[PDB]
Amino acid sequence: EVQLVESGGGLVQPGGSLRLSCVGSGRVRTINTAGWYRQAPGQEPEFLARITVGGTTSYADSVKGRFTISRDLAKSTVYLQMDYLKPEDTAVYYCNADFDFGSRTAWGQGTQVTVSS
Numbered sequence: 001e002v003q004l005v006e007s008g009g010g011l012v013q014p015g016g017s018l019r020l021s022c023v024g025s026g027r028v029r030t031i032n033t034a035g036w037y038r039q040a041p042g043q044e045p046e047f048l049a050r051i052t053v054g055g056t057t058s059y060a061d062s063v064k065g066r067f068t069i070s071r072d073l074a075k076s077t078v079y080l081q082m083d084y085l086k087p088e089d090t091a092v093y094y095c096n097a098d099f100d101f102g103s104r105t106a107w108g109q110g111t112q113v114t115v116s117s
């Protein structure tokens with residue numbers, strides 16, 4: 001069993017930046033990949049970025065060149081560095097983790113990001 005807890009987020013101006021954290025607890029060494037997703041108002045959740053234990057990353061086009069995903073294995077924490085922020089980035093941001101040889105999935109609780117002036 002794996003639990004994910006998110007922190008960071010809140011209100012930021014366009015052009016600002018924020019860092020989100022996704023802290024894993026439990027059997028974290030069984031985690032294979034972790035990803036970030038977001039759910040904008042009125043829309044379904046959308047994939048943003050993924051990272052492997054080895055640190056290989058992959059990104060959706062909507063955030064390529066603006067958001068960065070990273071992980072700290074010792075802290076069992078995956079990060080989303082959200083830069084060059086646009087009003088259209090306003091959403092609830094979720095992290096997930098695939099574990100047990102990619103056969104199970106855990107989700108964080110979500111954190112609101114509001115980009116507004």
Ligand SMILES: CCOP(=S)(OCC)Oc1ccc([N+](=O)[O-])cc1
Pocket residue numbers: 004022023024028029030031032033034051052053071072073074075076077078096097
């Ligand atoms: C959401 C937390 O993910 P975290 S950093 O995984 C990112 C892919 O999980 C870990 C942590 C430590 C090890 N390890 O081998 O020591 C392996 C995986």
